Amino acid sequence: KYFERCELARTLKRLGMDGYRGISLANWMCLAKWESGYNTRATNYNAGDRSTDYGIFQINSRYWCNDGKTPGAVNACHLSCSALLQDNIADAVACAKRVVRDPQGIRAWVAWRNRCQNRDVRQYVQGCGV
DSSP: OBOOHHHHHHHHHHTTOTTBTTBOHHHHHHHHHHHHSSBTTOEEEETTTTEEEETTTTEETTTTSBOSOSTTOOOTTOOBGGGGGSSSOHHHHHHHHHHHTSTTGGGGSHHHHHHTTTSOOGGGTTTSOO
């Protein structure tokens, strides 16, 4: 499913993402926007290392979820990567939270550094009632 901007903002807020490990909702919005365009079905195969990025936050199979086909991969979120392809994003959010509990925090996603860090991300949550 492709979420509408404010629909996603409130969906993430209800799932407890607002200020999680000090990360604002607008930061998460910017991340989902640049990672998948708010598409829970988004997928990207990385031919270089044989891994795949899954769902709305494009979480990688090498370390976070298990798809059974990534060489020497781990499953830190303890989830089948299929769970990251559901319209319901509760599991993807649980995993995104797991990712940010590590040292890097939101910096785990290079796209956040590229397109959200030190950027004006207000626009992502304006008018959403969050």
